[PDB]
Every structure is written in C-alpha cells, then in structure tokens.
Design a protein around this ligand. Structure first.
Ligand code: VM8
Ligand code: VM8
Length: 301
C-alpha cells in the first residue's frame, strides 16, 4: 500500500468527510460529509468539483450506480433517512425511503433498491419508487445491531439479519446461527458463499467452510474482480471503525496484509480497475469539538 494522494474537505475550518465511493468518472471520488453534503473531488489534486446538500444530518452511506445515472445516500437522523438521486445533467431527488437507515442497489441489474430498517428489509422498484417486498420473520430474527440487508450477485437471494431469503418466493430459506452482536454478513461475489463475521458458509450445503478470526466485527468490502477482500473493524462524531484494515485473498481467505493507519477509519472503497484504495481517516478523536477527516488514496494496485 503506497500512499498516492491525501486531501481534506475544502471550504471548511474542519474537514467532515464521512463516506466515499468512486464515481463512474475515473479520477473523481464522491464523498459524503457530516453536514449531509455530497461532493465530487479530484482524487489526485484534491480539488472540489461539485457540491449538493442531500441531507440536513451527516451522510452515513452512499452508493453510486455503475452506469453513472443514480446515487443512494443515507443520513443520520433526518427524515427522510435515505434517498435516491439522479445525476444526469441536473442533480435531483428521484425517491426517498422514509425510515430506511441504509440502502443498496441490486447487483446484476440495478433496477431495485434494498433498504434496512432495524431487523426488516424493504425492496423498492427504482422507476416507481414502490415498495415491492418486506422481508421479515420475527421467529428467525438475529437482531444484529449493524444489520445491512443485501442482494446476492444474481439479485435472486437476500441476506437480511442472518437470514437467507429467496426473492422470487419471498420465503426464508435458512437462518444462520448468531455468533456475534453486530455483523449480519455479505455475499461473496462468487455467488456460492456468505461471510458472516468470522464464519464463511457454503450456500449449497450450509457447511462451515472457514473460520477467520481476524474478520471479527469487520465490515467486508471486495475489490471489483473479487480476488481481494478488505476488512475494517467496528470501534469498541464517533468513528464507525478503528484504525486498521485487513486484506484477505478472496479465494482461500488467507491473510494478505494488516495496515494500521493510526487514525480511526470512517470508510474505504476501491476503483473499478482495483488500482486504488480510498480511505477516510480521522485526524481527531471522537472527543474533538469538530471532525477533521482526510481522504487518503493508496495504490494496491
Ligand atoms: C450532475 C452534475 C451537474 C454533474 C457535474 C457538475 C459539475 C462538475 C462535475 C459534475 C452534478 C453532479 C454531482 C455529483 C456529486 C455531488 C454533487 C453534484 C452536483 N451538484 C450540482 C451539479 N452536480
Ligand atoms: C454503519 C455504517 C454504514 C458502516 C457499517 C458498519 C457495520 C456494518 C455495515 C456498515 C457507517 C456508519 C457511519 C456513522 C457515522 C459516520 C460515517 C459512517 C459510515 N461511513 C461509511 C459506512 N458508515
């Protein structure tokens, strides 16, 4: 991991970056802020290119669509909590998702949104904004504190609160046992495995494939080719993560690197060519009057 660039928020006594994702335009990173702005930066010069006030509370998550035309955001206490934005010509709001505190696109065909409200997942149509499905079974809930509902790479399975759902049937297929308080899991991009905290489960057999202790309390991100997995660990404006991230081979789950950047991490993401890792790092503690985050770009890569 060679450092390539660093920048702080412009136009600001203190720097309030909270989350990031590369745009569909190469060289440009999208970042959310603690005042609910979405900004576009040149990742090498550190130049702010554009700004929009998406929310009147801190941005906690964003996801751009692959084709460049849409963006999801989630805020902190604002109503609506999550929204979908169009970014063709004029930046505008298309839909909002009133009490969903987290939202993702579908993966194969990005025509749906999946939102999380506590233990409950909601699936929405992008065009109409309509709620198509609610996935929730009170007998199967794990009540994970950092529940994030997510589609599998083919958009036909959902993981919500440690429960595997079939989207077409709207039926729970399997409940994975609860082995931690917080992390609910993701799908591996191979379509065959799920990573729930320290457990890797096979989707065809439900056997345990691997135990990876170093994934405890880690938010997992994959690079775009699906060969490397990045883990940032939840903290014991408070940072969501501690100051180290871990990388693993995505095919055999063997450790590649432990990087302690010595600053609490707010977010990390890779570009679509997997040359770079962008990391939001806090120069301040949570005791500071104000936030002072930087975006650091590392070549992996
Ligand atoms: C859609 C567009 C006009 C594109 C554009 C405009 C100027 C420079 C580069 C790209 C635009 C995009 C955007 C993306 C993220 C955060 C804010 C904005 C934003 N705020 C008002 C304008 N925009
Ligand atoms: C809760 C989460 C979505 C991170 C997460 C944790 C566990 C499981 C999945 C996802 C998140 C929270 C937050 C709160 C304050 C400021 C920035 C952020 C922020 N920036 C990128 C993500 N976040």
């Amino acid at each position: 991991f060679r450092p390539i660039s660093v920048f702080r928020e412009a136009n600001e006594d203190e720097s309030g970056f909270t989350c990031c994702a590369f745009s569909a335009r190469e060289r440009f990173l999208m970042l959310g802020t603690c005042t609910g702005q979405l900004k576009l930066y040149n990742v090498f010069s550190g130049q702010e290119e554009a700004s929009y006030n998406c929310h009147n509370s801190a941005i906690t998550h964003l996801e751009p669509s692959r084709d460049g035309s849409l963006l999801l955001t989630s805020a902190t206490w604002s109503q609506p909590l999550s929204a979908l934005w169009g970014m063709k010509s004029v930046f505008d709001m298309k839909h909002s998702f009133t009490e969903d505190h987290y939202v993702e696109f579908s993966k194969h065909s990005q025509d749906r949104v999946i939102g999380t409200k506590g233990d409950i997942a909601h699936i929405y149509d992008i065009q109409t904004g309509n709620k198509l499905l609610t996935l929730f079974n009170p007998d199967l809930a794990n009540n994970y504190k950092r529940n994030c509902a997510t589609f599998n790479p083919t958009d036909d399975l959902v993981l919500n609160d440690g429960v595997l759902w079939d989207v077409r049937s709207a039926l729970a297929i399997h409940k994975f046992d609860k082995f931690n308080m917080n992390i609910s899991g993701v799908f591996h991009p191979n379509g065959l495995e799920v990573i729930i905290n320290t457990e890797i489960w096979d989707l065809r057999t439900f056997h345990l494939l691997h135990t990876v202790p170093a994934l405890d309390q880690c938010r997992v991100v994959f690079n775009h080719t699906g060969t490397v997995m990045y883990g940032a660990m939840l903290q014991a404006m408070k940072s969501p993560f501690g100051s180290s991230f871990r990388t693993f081979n995505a095919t055999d789950y063997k450790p590649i690197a432990t990087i302690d950047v010595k600053r609490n991490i707010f977010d990390l993401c890779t570009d679509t060519k997997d040359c770079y890792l962008a990391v939001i790092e806090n120069q301040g503690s949570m005791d500071a009057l104000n936030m002072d985050t930087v975006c650091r770009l590392y070549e992996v890569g």
